[PDB]
């Protein structure tokens, strides 16, 4: 359930290289159907070309998640496809981006709590190519449940979770109306911010918008947000008290006074403190089997010899929800590789930690797995 303000109310008065990961959804098995994933994250701007390679050639039917971004405004995407790995086949991921002088290739190395509802909005101008690209996604914790893409054929707000498909036509007609108003706002703000910064009408620019609310384990309101960004940099944001603003440069100060005089913060406060939490409670109840579950990490260990003297130990954690997890090696915050948590594509998450140990001293190292779905923290050793 999105914000429902009039269009004129919220009217307005840095390049990062993607990190890449290639992996499978489940442990790879001969003749067993699986999913090959390529998780790009931390990049800006949003334009990116991702291919999945099989034996030195492109895979035809490749799908990807809907564009979203993190707290630092950097984007992340998950490219995936169904595949059955055999003995000879080799897989990789090729990524092209404005920060890369040539496409980068990464091979597939085969060997009670708080809740939140988020909405992310991205608009990228396309001078001469047509109207700006508008993408909107909605999240309940780490689960996407709605989407909108201006280039899609439906021109509707589409379900992306089973528990939201229950809603009737009155719901989807309303969300479709509200998401189109969000697009019209960004469309106007793109032309406004262009002249506000004295930029040419031939370049591409990006507007990002985030808002939502947090609730505790008692489902009572904790915090709300409403942030705005231009070209990956902070523009204007609502403070934690939900009555004042935080503006960055001079042009954002002008919007701060136009929004203060029009009392925009009070309309946002009513949604974040009331409407946002009300429908978050409805989503948590309707999708209780999905959103209130706690999937425990399925753990195991791998041993790989590096130089016949130093040996690498890797602690794995798979198929766990939610994404919050801690992995530590005890003999050690040095010489320990910890990879970023990544989506598996089926709602679960993955992570591993590595430790380079001398050969013969394998049984002197322990890995600790802290997860909220685990009653007692696990300790793993070779």
């Amino acid at each position, epitope marked *: 359930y999105m914000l429902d303000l009039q269009p004129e109310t919220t009217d307005l008065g840095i390049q990062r290289t993607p990190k890449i990961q290639v992996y499978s959804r489940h442990p790879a098995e001969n003749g067993k159907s699986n999913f090959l994933n390529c998780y790009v994250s931390g990049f800006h701007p949003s334009d990116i070309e991702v291919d999945l390679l099989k034996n030195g*050639e492109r895979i035809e039917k490749v799908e990807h998640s809907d564009l979203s971004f993190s707290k630092d405004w950097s984007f992340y995407l998950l490219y995936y496809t169904e595949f059955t790995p055999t003995e000879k086949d080799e897989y990789a991921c090729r990524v092209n981006h*404005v920060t890369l002088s*040539q496409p980068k290739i990464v091979k597939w190395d085969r060997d009670s709590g708080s809740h939140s509802m988020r909405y992310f909005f991205t608009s990228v101008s396309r001078p001469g190519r047509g109207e700006p690209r508008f993408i909107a996604v909605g999240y309940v914790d780490d689960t996407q449940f709605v989407r909108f893409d201006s280039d899609a054929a439906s021109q509707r707000m589409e379900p992306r979770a089973p528990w939201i498909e229950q809603e009737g036509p009155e719901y989807w007609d309303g969300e479709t109306r509200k998401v189109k108003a969000h697009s019209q706002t960004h469309r106007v703000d793109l032309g406004t911010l262009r002249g506000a910064y004295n930029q040419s009408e031939a370049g591409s620019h990006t507007v990002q918008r985030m808002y939502g609310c947090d609730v505790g384990s008692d489902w009572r309101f904790l915090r709300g947000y409403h942030q705005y960004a231009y070209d990956g940099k902070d523009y204007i944001a609502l403070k934690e008290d939900l009555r004042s603003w935080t503006a960055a440069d001079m042009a954002a100060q002008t919007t701060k006074h136009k929004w203060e005089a029009a009392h925009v913060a009070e309309q946002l406060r009513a949604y974040l403190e009331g409407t946002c939490v009300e429908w978050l409670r409805r989503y948590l109840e309707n999708g209780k089997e999905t959103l209130q579950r706690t999937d425990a990490p399925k753990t195991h260990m791998t041993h790989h010899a590096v130089s016949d003297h130093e040996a690498t130990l890797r602690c794995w954690a798979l198929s766990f929800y939610p994404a919050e997890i801690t992995l530590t090696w005890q003999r050690q915050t040095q010489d320990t590789e910890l990879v970023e948590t990544r989506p598996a594509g089926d709602g679960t998450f993955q992570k591993w930690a590595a430790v380079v140990v001398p050969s013969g001293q394998e049984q002197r190292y322990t890995c600790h797995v802290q997860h909220e779905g685990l009653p007692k923290p696990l300790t793993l050793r070779w």
Partner: nanobody
Amino acid sequence: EVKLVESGGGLVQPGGSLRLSCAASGSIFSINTMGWYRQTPGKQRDLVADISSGGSTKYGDSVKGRFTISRDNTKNTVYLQMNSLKPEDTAVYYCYGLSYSNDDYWGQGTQVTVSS
């Protein structure tokens, strides 16, 4: 390990054409997909066209309909027929190839200039 020999660049009038050629060295089993990228005014290079050893082709949006890639699979050599060339097509065109283990190889490139 693998070397790419490029030829067929140079100057051309608007509306004219040009045929680029790229030959890979080594065994025939050393290279699968072969194609071209072209240097943008900025940092990156953009996909023009590539083809697999089985004949599967892909074209960049900027060259669809005008450019055509073909392959002579008995000599691991690919050809790019660039028709209806415009000044916007002026760039250095890099040949590239992918090994069957997803190792990429890049040629030195050939300058292509379309007059005014």
